[PDB]
Ligand binder design. Sequence first.
Ligand SMILES: COc1ccc(-c2ccco2)cc1Nc1ncnc2[nH]nc(-c3ccco3)c12
Ligand SMILES: COc1ccc(-c2ccco2)cc1Nc1ncnc2[nH]nc(-c3ccco3)c12
Length: 545
Amino acid sequence: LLRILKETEFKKIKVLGSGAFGTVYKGLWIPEGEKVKIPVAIKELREKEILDEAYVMASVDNPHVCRLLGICLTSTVQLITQLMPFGCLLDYVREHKDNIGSQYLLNWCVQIAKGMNYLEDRRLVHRDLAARNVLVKTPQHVKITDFGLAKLLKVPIKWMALESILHRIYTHQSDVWSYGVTVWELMTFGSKPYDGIPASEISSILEKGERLPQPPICTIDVYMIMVKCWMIDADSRPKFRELIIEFSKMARDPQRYLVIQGEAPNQALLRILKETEFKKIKVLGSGAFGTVYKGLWIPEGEKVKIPVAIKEATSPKANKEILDEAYVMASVDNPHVCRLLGICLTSTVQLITQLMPFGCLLDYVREHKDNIGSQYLLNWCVQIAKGMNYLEDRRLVHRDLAARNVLVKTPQHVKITDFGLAKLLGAEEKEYHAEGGKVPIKWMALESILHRIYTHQSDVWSYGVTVWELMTFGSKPYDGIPASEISSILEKGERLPQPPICTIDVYMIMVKCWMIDADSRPKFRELIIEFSKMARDPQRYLVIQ
Ligand SMILES: COc1ccc(-c2ccco2)cc1Nc1ncnc2[nH]nc(-c3ccco3)c12
Ligand SMILES: COc1ccc(-c2ccco2)cc1Nc1ncnc2[nH]nc(-c3ccco3)c12
């Protein structure tokens, strides 16, 4: 296992690089009694724990993690490892900055995840994961070193987790943070991390919220997963095995999941904003997942203050849900759906979106109950229908279309919000089986109130309920009926009553969304068409007193 070596066995040739404690020398080792000259690397520390440290270093065995081959107890202890002809991965991606594909980068990320998951299985803390600490033997095979501070259980601040910078706690979660920084560096082809800011302040910027920006090569899929680790809560960071299985799922089709200049990729841009860039002025109310505040946002380089709505220790499940919500909201771009300006990666993940001055539609029709015209309501219906049609094309079942989840920006243009519960469906999947949970029971369909099945037709049912709410000028649907008793009274075929302003055609459109047979319910395109025909004469189809 351990080879105690004499200085006479090896002779150095050329210095290859410099490390934190000492420089690595390329040299040829002559084993005792042997003539084969093995090319090895020798590290000399600029200086008996090191005996046991070499023991534990040699104990490792995995093609993605390096093993110390021998030590030499001369005037200063030296470490001998097998030489890697292709150098460090950081310099390699720097040299091939224009000649590296997505497949190679994703494969390298897979290899790093596999190797440090092995290190976790061996129960060793690297404490120094970085792009420079990654070495490549053959371009399709990279494998980690620099275990010189491993213990049985300045400094590279730019690659260190916030708990390591401040509280000096080095666990596998900090290693996951360092892995995320390494993936960032590999994506940027070796660009500096937090370039321009010296190490004395990288703790404050991390605490403030600003993180490593999205590289142009990166999609929102890989990058938001490439963050996943920069929250203060350590447990919220993904474990290594999940990282390997997910990146291997990524490696199946790498071309789609990254963009290289020279199955539609998701080029959505997500930007990280300082907590100091914006201030919470007005409380818009309490959302389903928390409280939403309204305030002016000051962006870098532009003095104009854009009023934005901000939404907010969150549980790891809550963190994953807010991760999915941020992905879904940033991935959409439609005139009638709310878009994500950016996120703040503080201890409580904060969501930054454009503000609508008049508030939500339900409150707007409640306060102005005596003044909405027929054209306003009809155009509102067509706009909500267009928004969820665009959502349907994006395969994001909203699952929460309520009058509270649609906002009034301008009287003639409304937007949909509250994408927290929206789950993206696969290209082959047609239904999603939610495992229950606390939900607005009084709005969902029978197939979701009893069978836990959410589909596009569930969104159609929610659309019908929202139309009924809009035509009722803000009256509460199903007044006095419990949450559990909704299914009992609805399985027969009884529905909400007729608003005073709805003609027979309005109700005939409304009912069809509420049919027991989901497949027989109208699709959103046909509803869009029907309400487009209704828009030719708003005064005919409604009666206003
Ligand atoms: C950061 O690099 C290291 C850190 C630690 C060691 C190590 C571990 C035990 C003995 O040496 C060894 C290396 N480096 C290496 N080990 C083998 N072959 C190598 N070819 N090129 C390098 C290289 C260039 C710049 C940094 O490393 C290198
Ligand atoms: C249910 O409503 C939301 C749910 C989530 C967000 C949000 C903020 C960041 C990402 O999504 C934003 C909103 N709503 C909003 N978005 C823009 N301007 C708004 N003015 N007033 C509200 C408001 C009051 C009660 C519920 O919303 C609102």
